[PDB]
Amino acid sequence: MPIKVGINGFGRIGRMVFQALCEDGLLGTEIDVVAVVDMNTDAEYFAYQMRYDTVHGKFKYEVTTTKSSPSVAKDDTLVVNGHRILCVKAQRNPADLPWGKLGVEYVIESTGLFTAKAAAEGHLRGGARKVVISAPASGGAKTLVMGVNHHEYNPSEHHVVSNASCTTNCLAPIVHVLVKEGFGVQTGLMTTIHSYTATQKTVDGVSVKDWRGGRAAAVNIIPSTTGAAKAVGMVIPSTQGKLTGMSFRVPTPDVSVVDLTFTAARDTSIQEIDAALKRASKTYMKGILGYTDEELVSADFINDNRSSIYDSKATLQNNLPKERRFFKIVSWYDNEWGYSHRVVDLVRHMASKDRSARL
Template sequence: DGHSITVFQERDPANIQWGSVGADYVVESSGVFTTVDKASAHLKGGAKKVIISAPSADAPMFVVGVNLDAYDSKYTVISNASCTTNCLAPLAKVINDKFGIVEGLMSTIHATTATQKTVDGPSNKDWRGGRAVNGNIIPSSTGAAKAVGKVIPTLNGKLTGLAFRVPTNDVSVVDLVV
């Protein structure tokens, strides 16, 4: 169609010249640069804003329909949480606003991720993490319940959760029991 797409190949986001292609907003989805300090490297190349597509230890975190009204345009780096948090937080907000939540357990079915093994092997985290991703449903931990506490402070510490990693390319389903 005559449109070109510029592709960069850099290990250090500070070396990517976002300004040269007119990119004002950068979505940081590598899973590596998830803190404000690390994600801010994109700003050095000319980006005006960075959205981290994972939970962040220190970036302001927002979920559309939950706490987006707290967004301030002065933020240059924000987190859009995780796919599981984006699935869980709106549900938890509606239930909490209408009825209140004393405590809850969430379980999620989640697609495979890049950190999982393709063949059985050792895992630094736990035995289950060493199972081959393509032929197993693997119980795992999830930070989604904790992240909900960041976007809905009244639920901080009230939710816990577990994940099941399944051999599919794309899925995030949440079951919440309160």
């Protein structure tokens, strides 16, 4: 049985979620994407955006356009791999999307505008059953990180969920292995060296609520607060108040790295941490946590679908010799791709669990 999905906000993630939703061969069989929504209804423009991606290259699937019925002005329907996706009109208010009529039960909320759970329940007002916010939520939405706490998904209780941030999805798996392996975490500070994003500015512009983020994005190292590490304390509750961090947004369009400096609860070694991470990645963290022992740079993690790619060499080489407690872990992530894949994993995990809890 195909699950009926709707993507509200067809941007980097709204669209990579779709590409991710296709790359896995899921479109039309396991997942029917019933409707995607951006500003316009222009299937030709939507399709163009899908076809060509500056970072992720050309979309593997042929995208065509058609009309829902001849009484429509322009093609308002994408056709991906024979499957038809209607382009619905954006709404200032999620409550005004016609989800029920469409028969969409799962809304991927990827606008960046409705991270407030109250707003994101708008979709449930429009007829959906579940929303997955492609961002940290606010207002008590259950935050779920695949491979970390996603099994805490309660079908009967969790209707509007957050898939956390890309950064949390990179960090949390690392911290989860640290915790699960018994290294523990006294405290940690993470810095993400972060590719610039849609909210940033080509040239110095107005950014009233973040002055640095208003600065020319591709020519600056631009510091920023981030709630990603604090957010881990909500996904891995034993790390609450133990982690924070920041971001430096740097002139790359995609791919980021977590630089986690933490203190372990008891004596260990970076070697043990590195052996754990590598085993975790092979096993109970498989598909979520990867590692490389290669000399990779950011471009090499483009289209990596893991949420965290432990950089073994950068980690092993850049720690204190003989150190027992105070460690740095480097883990990469394609902030766009890894995350978008996780959204799909989440949606899929929720659907199997919604199936189980029904029949």
